[PDB]
C-alpha cells in the first residue's frame, strides 16, 4: 500500500511509511522488503524523488538489519552507481540553497560503508572518498572519516597488507577511468598509511613497486600534480621513517641518484620552480629524513641545510622547523671532520645577511634557540646573536615575535653559561645581562595598565635575571642607574605611573640582594 | 689597520675577478669588527669615491659586474651613519633611473633598498631628486599598459620595489600634493592582461600596485574610477593560486579596503556579489590555509552590507556558509563567527520576508537544521574529546584549555542563534500569529532539544590552578559563576515562545530524557524552573511533568539520586502552582 509510486511520492505517506519501518516492531515489514531487493533497482534511476525515497528506505533497512549486506550485490551495483555518478554530484551541488532531499548523501554514504565493511571491496572503499575530504560535506564527513581513521587501521590489513596495497596501486587503471587527479587519487593515500603506521611499528615487494611505478613526476607528466605531490612526499617520508628501514630501503634505493626518491625530490626543491611552499618544503623534509638515516652523499647535506636556511622567508615555519628537528642532529654527527666547516658556513650565511631581513633573522634565531644543546661548542658565534638581540629589543615590538624572541634568546645564553660553568665574551655577557635588566622592566609597559596578558612573560624574565646571577657571571654586571631613574622617576609625572615601576622595584630588590652578597655596590647607589 | 689594508688594495682592472671579492671580505671583517670615532667618517669619505669609480665602469649576466653590485650591496648594508649620506644619495638616484623595466639584474632592487634605508634620516633638501624619481614613477606607471601589450605569446620585480619604496617614502615626510598625482596614476593603472611565469610576475606587480593603492583606507580621495577597482578585483580572481604569501598579502590589502563604509556599499552591486566564499577568495587547488582570514573578511563585509541584499544573494550566501560551518578542519573560532553572522542575518531575512512573497521560511528552517546538526555534532564529539582526558580526583594542555573555552563559547552562540531563529520562523509566512508548527519542524525541534540538552553539558569541566582540567561534581547547588545560567535560560526561552500545543507534544515526547539528563546533570534543573516561571507555558509543562512522575513514583524507593531529583521536581511544581495558582 505504501510502495505505490503515487503514494510513495507523496511526502505524507512516505514519512508515515518511514516512521513505521523505523519502529522496533517493524521486523516483518522489513523482511518483505529484504526479500525483494530488485524493487529498489526500479527506483534508483519529472520523477527523480523515487531515487531519494529508495535510498532512504535502504538506509533504514541496513540500520535495522546490519547483516543484509552480502545479499544486495545487485542493489549496490546501482547504489554505488548513483554515488559515483557525476549527475548526482552536480544535481546535489549546483543548487542547494533550500533544496529538499538534503540528507540523501549522508544515508547513501552510510549504507555504502555498511556494505563495504562486511566485504572488502577496494574500488568501492576508495570511491567512498568522493565525500570523505572533497566533494560535498554536510554531516557526511565524520561518520566515514572516523571509521577510516580508527576502524580501518584496526583489523583491515591484518593478513594482506601487501596485497591490499598492491590493489590500491592497481586502482590507478579503474581510477583514471573516472578520476584522474588528486581529488580522489590524493585522498587514497590516507586510508592506507593509517594502517601502514599503526603496523609500521613484512611487505618488501610493495617498497620496490612504489618507487618504480610512481617514477619521478609520475607518468612523466608534472602538470597534473597539484596536491598529490605533497601527500606522496609525506608517504615517502613516513616510509623511510618507520615501516621499511635500511634493511628494506637500501635494496632499491641504491639507485637514489637515479629516478628513485632522491631525484624525485632534489630537482624540484633545488630549482626556483614549484613556487608552492608546501611541496617544496615537504621535499626538503623528505631529503632531511633520508639524510638522517642513510644516503651519506658528497656533502649534499650542507646544500640542503643552506637551501632550508635561506628559504624560510614568511610562512615556512612548521615544515622547516620539523626538517631542522629531524636534520639538525644528523649533519654534525655525520660531519665530525667538518664541525668547524659547518659552523663557519653557518657564520657565513649569518654575516651575508646584511640586509637583516627581519623575518629571516627571527626564524634563524628561533632555529638556533630550539637547539640549545648543539651549539655549546661554538661560543665564538654568540657575539652575532647577542648583537642581534640588542637591536631586536630596541625596536617597537608591539608584535609578539621580536621581544619575546629576544628574551628567550637571552635564556639560551643563560643556559649555555650554566652548562659551561657546570660542565665567554665578558663585555657581551655584561651587555646581555644589562639588556635582560632593561627588557624585563620595559615589556611591562608594552601591555596596558591592567586587564591584559604580558605580565607572566615579565615575571619569567625576572626569574631568568634572578637565576643568571647565581653563576659566577654576576660580578661584572653593570647597574642601569639612568634607566631605573628615568622609569621610576615617572612617578613624579602623575601620567603613566603604571605597575612598570613595581617590576622596577622588584628588580631593584634583586640588585639589593646582589649588594647584600657584595656590598661594593654601595658606592653605585648614588643615582 | 683596516684603513691602510683597504687603501693599499686599491685595484681598478688589473685583477677584476677575485681582488674585488677579497676586498669585499676585508670590508665585511671591518664591519663586523668595532670601529672607533677617529676611524668612522674618513672610511666612508674614502669609500664614496671608490664606489663612484667602481660604478662608472661596467653598467642573465654573470660577469664581474655581479660582484661589483654585490660590493655595492655590502656598502649599503654598512648603514654606518647619516653625515656621509649626501653623495651616496646622488650616486644611488643616478644609478636608479637607467635601464629599468627591462631584463636588468638586481642592481635596481638593492638601489631601492638603499633608497628606503636612506630617507629614514629625514633629509629636507633631497626632495628634488626623489621628486624626479616620482616623475619616473609617473612614467613607468603610465607605460605599464604598453609593456604588457607589447609582450604577447609570440625581471618584472622592479614595480613592487618601487611601489613599496614610494609608500614608505610618502608615509614619513610632510604631507604634500604629490600623493594626488599618485592617485591620478592609480586611475591609469594597468588592468588588462616560463614566459607565463613572467606574466604571473606582472600580475603580482599589479598586486603590489594595489597594495600601494591601500591608501583608499586613509584620507579621503576623489574616487571616480570604480571601473578600475572592479577590473583589479577581477584580476585578483585571475591571480595565481600557487603563491600563498602574495595571495595572503592581497587578501589583507582587500580586507583593509573593505574596512570603510564608503567602499562597502559599492561591493554588493558588483557581479551580484556572487564572488563570495566560492573558490575565488582562496586558492583554487594549491593551498587553503589562509582560509580563516578570507572567511573573516567576507563575514565582516556581508555583515556591514546585509541591509541591501535580495533573496538570491542571501540564499546563496547561506548556502556557501553552512558548508564551512561544519568543516572540522577550521578552528572553532570561525564556527562561532559564522554562527554569529547567521543569527544576525536571520533578523534581516525575517524583516525582508515582507517582500517578494517571503520565501524566507524555507531558508530559515534549512539553517535551523544545520544549527541543530552542529549542536548534535558538538554534543557527540566535543564532550567525548574532553572526557577522554579528564583527571579524576585532581604545553598541549594550555591549548586544550583554550579549545575548551572556545567550545564553551560555541555552545552559547549556538543557543543564542537557535533562539533568534525560533523567533524568526514564528514571525514570517497571509501570516497568522502563533501558527501551529508543522510535523517536520516539530520533530526537528524535538531532536533540537534532545541534542542541545547534551551540548549544554560542556559547563561541567573546570580549569585548575596548575593547568590540568577537572570534571565537576554531580550536584553542588552553586551559581556556576553565572556563565551558563543565562545560557540555559535562553535555551528555555527558545521554547517558551512557540505555540502552546506544540510545546505540549515536544515535551510530552522529551520529558523522560529531560529528567534523565537532569539527574545526570543537575544544572539543567533551571530549564524546568524557567519553563514553570514563564506564563502561557507553565501549566502545560507542569501537567506533563506530573503526569510523567505519577507513573514513576515507585522508582523513588530503589535509589536516592532519582528520588531526590523527583522531590526537587515536585518542589518546583508546587512553587509554580503557588505562582500560577
mmCIF file with all atom_site columns, N, CA and C in Angstrom, chain B residues 114-135:
data_model
loop_
_atom_site.group_PDB
_atom_site.id
_atom_site.type_symbol
_atom_site.label_atom_id
_atom_site.label_alt_id
_atom_site.label_comp_id
_atom_site.label_asym_id
_atom_site.label_entity_id
_atom_site.label_seq_id
_atom_site.pdbx_PDB_ins_code
_atom_site.Cartn_x
_atom_site.Cartn_y
_atom_site.Cartn_z
_atom_site.occupancy
_atom_site.B_iso_or_equiv
_atom_site.pdbx_formal_charge
_atom_site.auth_seq_id
_atom_site.auth_comp_id
_atom_site.auth_asym_id
_atom_site.auth_atom_id
_atom_site.pdbx_PDB_model_num
ATOM 1  N N  . UNK B 1 114 ? 68.469 50.697 -0.631  1.00 0.00 ? 114 UNK B N  1
ATOM 2  C CA . UNK B 1 114 ? 69.264 51.771 -0.042  1.00 0.00 ? 114 UNK B CA 1
ATOM 3  C C  . UNK B 1 114 ? 68.480 53.075 -0.048  1.00 0.00 ? 114 UNK B C  1
ATOM 4  N N  . UNK B 1 115 ? 67.627 53.293 -1.051  1.00 0.00 ? 115 UNK B N  1
ATOM 5  C CA . UNK B 1 115 ? 66.778 54.482 -1.037  1.00 0.00 ? 115 UNK B CA 1
ATOM 6  C C  . UNK B 1 115 ? 65.866 54.463 0.184   1.00 0.00 ? 115 UNK B C  1
ATOM 7  N N  . UNK B 1 116 ? 65.282 53.303 0.484   1.00 0.00 ? 116 UNK B N  1
ATOM 8  C CA . UNK B 1 116 ? 64.421 53.180 1.656   1.00 0.00 ? 116 UNK B CA 1
ATOM 9  C C  . UNK B 1 116 ? 65.221 53.429 2.928   1.00 0.00 ? 116 UNK B C  1
ATOM 10 N N  . UNK B 1 117 ? 66.377 52.774 3.053   1.00 0.00 ? 117 UNK B N  1
ATOM 11 C CA . UNK B 1 117 ? 67.215 52.963 4.233   1.00 0.00 ? 117 UNK B CA 1
ATOM 12 C C  . UNK B 1 117 ? 67.823 54.359 4.297   1.00 0.00 ? 117 UNK B C  1
ATOM 13 N N  . UNK B 1 118 ? 67.671 55.159 3.243   1.00 0.00 ? 118 UNK B N  1
ATOM 14 C CA . UNK B 1 118 ? 68.285 56.478 3.155   1.00 0.00 ? 118 UNK B CA 1
ATOM 15 C C  . UNK B 1 118 ? 67.353 57.579 3.651   1.00 0.00 ? 118 UNK B C  1
ATOM 16 N N  . UNK B 1 119 ? 66.075 57.517 3.275   1.00 0.00 ? 119 UNK B N  1
ATOM 17 C CA . UNK B 1 119 ? 65.121 58.550 3.655   1.00 0.00 ? 119 UNK B CA 1
ATOM 18 C C  . UNK B 1 119 ? 64.726 58.487 5.123   1.00 0.00 ? 119 UNK B C  1
ATOM 19 N N  . UNK B 1 120 ? 65.217 57.505 5.880   1.00 0.00 ? 120 UNK B N  1
ATOM 20 C CA . UNK B 1 120 ? 64.914 57.444 7.304   1.00 0.00 ? 120 UNK B CA 1
ATOM 21 C C  . UNK B 1 120 ? 65.530 58.605 8.073   1.00 0.00 ? 120 UNK B C  1
ATOM 22 N N  . UNK B 1 121 ? 66.551 59.256 7.514   1.00 0.00 ? 121 UNK B N  1
ATOM 23 C CA . UNK B 1 121 ? 67.197 60.381 8.177   1.00 0.00 ? 121 UNK B CA 1
ATOM 24 C C  . UNK B 1 121 ? 66.421 61.684 8.035   1.00 0.00 ? 121 UNK B C  1
ATOM 25 N N  . UNK B 1 122 ? 65.375 61.713 7.209   1.00 0.00 ? 122 UNK B N  1
ATOM 26 C CA . UNK B 1 122 ? 64.548 62.905 7.025   1.00 0.00 ? 122 UNK B CA 1
ATOM 27 C C  . UNK B 1 122 ? 65.393 64.079 6.522   1.00 0.00 ? 122 UNK B C  1
ATOM 28 N N  . UNK B 1 123 ? 65.938 63.910 5.317   1.00 0.00 ? 123 UNK B N  1
ATOM 29 C CA . UNK B 1 123 ? 66.758 64.939 4.691   1.00 0.00 ? 123 UNK B CA 1
ATOM 30 C C  . UNK B 1 123 ? 65.863 65.863 3.873   1.00 0.00 ? 123 UNK B C  1
ATOM 31 N N  . UNK B 1 124 ? 65.685 67.124 4.262   1.00 0.00 ? 124 UNK B N  1
ATOM 32 C CA . UNK B 1 124 ? 64.803 68.022 3.501   1.00 0.00 ? 124 UNK B CA 1
ATOM 33 C C  . UNK B 1 124 ? 65.307 68.260 2.086   1.00 0.00 ? 124 UNK B C  1
ATOM 34 N N  . UNK B 1 125 ? 66.556 68.710 1.914   1.00 0.00 ? 125 UNK B N  1
ATOM 35 C CA . UNK B 1 125 ? 66.958 69.266 0.609   1.00 0.00 ? 125 UNK B CA 1
ATOM 36 C C  . UNK B 1 125 ? 67.040 68.248 -0.519  1.00 0.00 ? 125 UNK B C  1
ATOM 37 N N  . UNK B 1 126 ? 66.833 66.961 -0.255  1.00 0.00 ? 126 UNK B N  1
ATOM 38 C CA . UNK B 1 126 ? 66.897 65.942 -1.294  1.00 0.00 ? 126 UNK B CA 1
ATOM 39 C C  . UNK B 1 126 ? 65.508 65.625 -1.855  1.00 0.00 ? 126 UNK B C  1
ATOM 40 N N  . UNK B 1 127 ? 64.527 66.499 -1.616  1.00 0.00 ? 127 UNK B N  1
ATOM 41 C CA . UNK B 1 127 ? 63.180 66.251 -2.119  1.00 0.00 ? 127 UNK B CA 1
ATOM 42 C C  . UNK B 1 127 ? 63.098 66.435 -3.630  1.00 0.00 ? 127 UNK B C  1
ATOM 43 N N  . UNK B 1 128 ? 64.050 67.160 -4.222  1.00 0.00 ? 128 UNK B N  1
ATOM 44 C CA . UNK B 1 128 ? 64.011 67.397 -5.662  1.00 0.00 ? 128 UNK B CA 1
ATOM 45 C C  . UNK B 1 128 ? 64.357 66.130 -6.437  1.00 0.00 ? 128 UNK B C  1
ATOM 46 N N  . UNK B 1 129 ? 65.403 65.421 -6.008  1.00 0.00 ? 129 UNK B N  1
ATOM 47 C CA . UNK B 1 129 ? 65.794 64.203 -6.709  1.00 0.00 ? 129 UNK B CA 1
ATOM 48 C C  . UNK B 1 129 ? 64.768 63.095 -6.511  1.00 0.00 ? 129 UNK B C  1
ATOM 49 N N  . UNK B 1 130 ? 64.201 62.976 -5.308  1.00 0.00 ? 130 UNK B N  1
ATOM 50 C CA . UNK B 1 130 ? 63.138 61.997 -5.126  1.00 0.00 ? 130 UNK B CA 1
ATOM 51 C C  . UNK B 1 130 ? 61.876 62.449 -5.847  1.00 0.00 ? 130 UNK B C  1
ATOM 52 N N  . UNK B 1 131 ? 61.717 63.756 -6.074  1.00 0.00 ? 131 UNK B N  1
ATOM 53 C CA . UNK B 1 131 ? 60.624 64.214 -6.926  1.00 0.00 ? 131 UNK B CA 1
ATOM 54 C C  . UNK B 1 131 ? 60.839 63.782 -8.372  1.00 0.00 ? 131 UNK B C  1
ATOM 55 N N  . UNK B 1 132 ? 62.085 63.816 -8.847  1.00 0.00 ? 132 UNK B N  1
ATOM 56 C CA . UNK B 1 132 ? 62.378 63.271 -10.170 1.00 0.00 ? 132 UNK B CA 1
ATOM 57 C C  . UNK B 1 132 ? 62.132 61.767 -10.205 1.00 0.00 ? 132 UNK B C  1
ATOM 58 N N  . UNK B 1 133 ? 62.439 61.075 -9.106  1.00 0.00 ? 133 UNK B N  1
ATOM 59 C CA . UNK B 1 133 ? 62.127 59.651 -9.022  1.00 0.00 ? 133 UNK B CA 1
ATOM 60 C C  . UNK B 1 133 ? 60.622 59.415 -9.094  1.00 0.00 ? 133 UNK B C  1
ATOM 61 N N  . UNK B 1 134 ? 59.836 60.281 -8.452  1.00 0.00 ? 134 UNK B N  1
ATOM 62 C CA . UNK B 1 134 ? 58.384 60.169 -8.547  1.00 0.00 ? 134 UNK B CA 1
ATOM 63 C C  . UNK B 1 134 ? 57.893 60.478 -9.956  1.00 0.00 ? 134 UNK B C  1
ATOM 64 N N  . UNK B 1 135 ? 58.581 61.371 -10.668 1.00 0.00 ? 135 UNK B N  1
ATOM 65 C CA . UNK B 1 135 ? 58.252 61.601 -12.072 1.00 0.00 ? 135 UNK B CA 1
ATOM 66 C C  . UNK B 1 135 ? 58.532 60.352 -12.902 1.00 0.00 ? 135 UNK B C  1
#
